[PDB]
């Protein structure tokens, strides 16, 4: 890439950040109980639990049936010198992708630990308070919290005799219908195929009044630095059990880690408008350019958070470009496109390493110590300004001081190759198609003639 | 459609589901009061209600004025020999569409029931419960409702003498400003013309702390199957009265029904990347194909919920398929197209009816019953695997078993027709300006230079 | 623009509205405190505040460090003997844009008032009410505010001795983690650069239970007319101080003003389907056209609210248009394109000042005054209907009265110049310039064979 | 040898788990004992003399 | 029958029957026609499968 030619065409080199990908996830198990444990409300709670149980049993059973059918598709067998594992029936699975097979193998791996957690069902159902982490000894652990247990431990509990018990029953009915709406909301796509779809951790936190940091602290991840404080929306994980007796869901989540791809640098750019031909044009270049050892790729940070120093993507999102884009970035300003703008929110001056790249044709340019105007040269379009001209610079209204040095050559004395104006239209495509059709039906007629008039 | 040749080019036939569209909605009338009914708060309330009333009058009055002004534009009566038809004064509308005319006809139909409900205005204002019912007629009832009646029937009510009255006034003021912000949020577009704009039941549920099925159960519609569980975000409603005296809105909502268009099958597909020419190409084929009586069209599931067995759309979204894309789904699969995929998250193998489609040049293939690797055939890129080669298969890192058979003929043996590469950029449109201008007046040079010597 | 030719091709002139842009904002300074001043809970609170303090200090300190670092590069005292103003150290900025320099100038201007407010730090930290005011000067005041100060002055306070101290400490812990998650949610992009990023008033509002109206009332803006009720989602503001002692944020917001651009009228259009060639087509025109002294241009109301009388934008969004589209709007219906539809939700009739534009080929058209059907003319497609034919009109099912007349030019007798059937270009038409261009490069080889024709 | 390397790298966590009860190992006063490794797991400490 | 072995960081591997890869580049390693025993050092790839 040539930054002098890219400055002549109108792009200014922005910051440079790093690139990091989530990788190497270890697994930690939790459970999520559904039935609220009321113990103080044994005096008057009526049977308001029954409608809630009837509502949740319609959405507890088929997930359990689907997961046990997933365990039925796999079978721990070994033909000859096999790996002594995996093995699924092709007929018993129907149509599946690679990730569905991976989920089946994950279930076949963690069925033992699912049985280990299911061994403590009576310990699960006796949790009076909401958030606790239990364990299977020194190694392996499980966690549980309920976003509604505190509301019937500090809110619904103390009005046990001041308020009428029918009003407590009605309030608990309203609260249970609201929370059943919340579980109905979060497990929207989870009702279709509850083995291959991961769980958004923020949507899980929405069950508990949007407290991502409570589950972050209770999960064990304790971020300290700047980069991992914003990170934490990339936890993911899939359900492993949907036990009906204790009315709980055993979930497995992944503890993330940000590994770094070597040699890859994300490059930002600033696009300013330039007045050529009495017209304001913007350069047509992508904003982000990732470089890794003479290799330009394209990325999209649609789901990627950007810190002050790096790019944090959940997974690598490399995209290709045309080799004409490589010619535009390397040497060919004629291959670089342009677009028409007339709106007022176009920047015309910018700052880079104490060097001002300014379109002085539309913006006022002066040096305040000398009190003289700065005129646009006819050879250039984008004006380079350093301390060689004046260290004291006045641009528009703003009052700046510049410094450092130029850097190789000035962009102003190099010639500027203006490319074609990039402006498309479906009408242009349609009458181009008509033009191409009539012209090649002319040429094929004359080629049939000129092939028949070869031999005279 | 030929799945064998389309599998050879790289498209795998997925699940087949049904198509069902919402049709025949019946009507039911609800009423929503806005002023909270305090009856226990006659001791300490001050006049904090007046600020809330002055805030909501600017919403209530012009909505009701526009409603009665739209009510004036329609009249009944016989046009001579014709009996009726709700004759609409077109000079009183200005610019109106078909849906506005239909809505005006709907309110003219609902004038009688709106007056019948408005006869029970003093019945509406006397409620002190959250949600309760009043008998509209001998077999009709109304569904007067408040989400915030409960909050000043269980929270502010017991603190009548423990806390100071000015603090209850301040908390009531804060809650009233928050609720007025909620009505300002939900009736945003509804202030412009409150007679043609449909009302979402979800944004209404946001007024009552996001409890959808409380409103659904008070409506009386009850879901009992898997399809009507995720259904519930598509119930629409219309304002039929905007009464300023009791400060309430009479609304008419529509109970949905998922009718089935006959013969329509939604076919899914799996796209994999195949290495041709040293490059990993992805085919350019869509995902969801509606098929109905040998007719291929396009659909978009941008708002349609997807079940395990069917596609549920609020309204029919049949878009025309490109006949080039229809011939792509026919035997001319060279007309399909392909693009670069260099990213690592490209699947290379998939399962369908015990049938493995695998790009085996990059993915390790062996059969542990024979302990030999599987090599890519030279006549194809996509690799067929069934029980005929080996019933027990290793693909990549995973160990599977297969079944069934090929299907008509094997897609691995016939010749292959490779399409063109596909780019998506306006830079390609400027390059098509350039290379046609390399060719067009060079084709005119064919027209000139041939005829110069074809004479003799 | 010709409405008669555009109605002949199938487009009806909609409403005409105004265009207003936010401009000339003044600035008001507010403060936001973070540490909840619990005063009644000095008996049983433990040191649960310390975990909250250690969680928020890692956010508060780097924001304050970047804030003092950005203000440390700007200086007064211009070395020019006549000009005097603020100078930024452009070598010390590195890379910066126009808005960043303007923001640094703004904080340099506001540093004096920031120190003036910072002189009242003990006044800021001593508040025990939710929102109140303090004496900044003889006429200036601050608007110190807390959403959570109510919740530990009306909810957690009365359970001081009924409930156990550790349960209050745990409830305080849960509430503190949830609110700390809320501050982590709202100050997401602000952690990268808290100088050049404005803060939305609604993002501030979700810190206080989504109460935009409380912040609007305490800020001083009191919307009274219909246009400023929907406006209020576009209020901008930036931080001026990030004090770590009282752990508060001094913010500067901009009070907006909706100025009106002169002469600009926004025009809507209604596109009706027309049956040409046995086929249903739609004209290809934009929905909204801004006209300003005979100047057609394009806008996008993607972030602009739409009122009943005007278009209100936060900032001007003037987009250019193709001159072929301008000829399409003015005179050239042959330059206007058309697209294919077959879906059922295409209205074929509409009303405009009592003028019925109705395609009678698919929609039943009758005159109820005479009981005769209305036939489509062969010279037109869209049916003009006014009081000249019949005053009482049957369309579809509906009785409709009509009004006015043809105005100036009758489109019912005008000739038809429906242009080319232009086609969409989703992914495929690039290969129609990629499989036809290789026929062109077959003819490029035929140029070499034409050279052989010339030689032989 | 590489397979043995993989085996020790595979079983070093369980080796640390068994080494966590070193004082439980030295307190046996009988011939053969079975001490609980985890919840449903055990090893065999043994001394024929 | 062993088909690969290590000698001072030198891998002699019969890659015709044994899978051979370099995950720095994520490509397989093929068999030459001039030899059967495959020479592998860090000049091809430092980390080998
Ligand atoms: C999931 O798998 C279990 C276990 O069955 C095992 O896996 C299957 C995939 C097949 O390969 C089986 O051969 C294999 O054993 C299934 O549970 C089994 O269900 C069947 C009925 O489907 C039970 O048979 C019944 O048993 C008694 C006999 O007295 C009578 O009620 C009936 O006449 C009937 O024969 C069987 O006992 C039961 N258990 C076992 C160990 O086989 C299970 O059905 C299967 N699938 C699903 C969808 O749940
Ligand atoms: C909605 O309609 C009602 C009813 O009026 C009927 O419908 C209109 C659309 C027109 O076609 C009317 O001719 C038709 O009767 C309107 O209420 C009417 O308002 C008018 C004023 O606009 C009243 O007239 C006034 O009445 C008294 C007479 O002593 C004096 O104050 C004035 O001199 C003046 O004449 C009229 O009484 C009233 N009622 C009726 C039955 O006509 C209403 O205005 C209309 N539109 C809106 C926007 O509210
Ligand atoms: C923000 O600006 C302050 C003020 O300093 C002034 O501005 C700077 C940009 C420079 O141009 C300075 O020359 C100018 O005075 C800076 O604070 C200063 O930092 C220096 C260290 O960089 C301090 O010196 C220390 O002082 C004591 C002496 O006992 C000892 O701790 C050390 O040995 C060391 O010398 C200095 O006191 C301090 N203040 C002043 C008034 O100069 C600051 O660095 C700058 N930047 C930031 C990021 O805060
Ligand atoms: C409420 O339940 C708790 C926890 O079990 C117990 O300590 C307390 O005594 C109960 N109170 C009453 C009144 O039952
Ligand atoms: C592109 O740049 C190269 C040098 O990098 C030069 O040789 C070539 O002529 C340029 N092509 C253009 C301007 O079309
Ligand atoms: C730019 O070129 C001109 C001559 O065209 C020369 O005077 C000037 O020094 C050059 N600037 C550089 C190389 O930075
Ligand atoms: C060009 O396009 C059409 C299809 O739109 C094709 O059928 C026709 O033969 C071509 N030629 C002409 C002269 O229209
Ligand atoms: C509160 O209001 C209800 C409903 O009107 C009534 O039954 C009850 O007696 C009231 N309580 C008091 C203390 O006034
Ligand atoms: C498309 O397939 C048909 C048979 O279905 C064949 O006649 C025709 O030549 C093919 N066209 C191509 C490959 O362009
Ligand atoms: C594919 O063709 C080969 C010969 O090229 C033949 O052996 C094989 O049976 C064919 N597969 C079918 C018809 O399924
Ligand atoms: C070639 O360029 C000319 C202008 O020089 C333009 O009129 C013409 O349309 C271009 N040809 C195309 C786009 O095929
Ligand atoms: C609660 O705090 C307020 C305000 O400081 C004070 O007036 C009141 O006496 C306190 N009450 C108790 C019980 O501490
Ligand atoms: C466009 O309209 C103008 C008059 O407004 C006319 O002169 C011109 O021929 C038209 N062009 C077409 C129909 O292509
Ligand atoms: C439309 O033109 C016809 C003749 O073509 C004429 O009879 C009729 O009056 C015209 N309508 C007008 C000018 O409104
Ligand atoms: C133009 O044709 C060449 C040669 O057939 C081909 O490589 C190229 O991809 C074509 N251009 C486009 C834009 O498809």
Numbering used by the authors:
A (entry chain A), B (entry chain B), C (entry chain C): 22 to 477
D (entry chain D): 121 to 169
E (entry chain E): 367 to 415
List sentences quoted exactly from the publication behind this structure.
Cryo-electron microscopy structures of diverse fusion proteins elucidated molecular determinants of differential pre-fusion state metastability and higher order contacts.
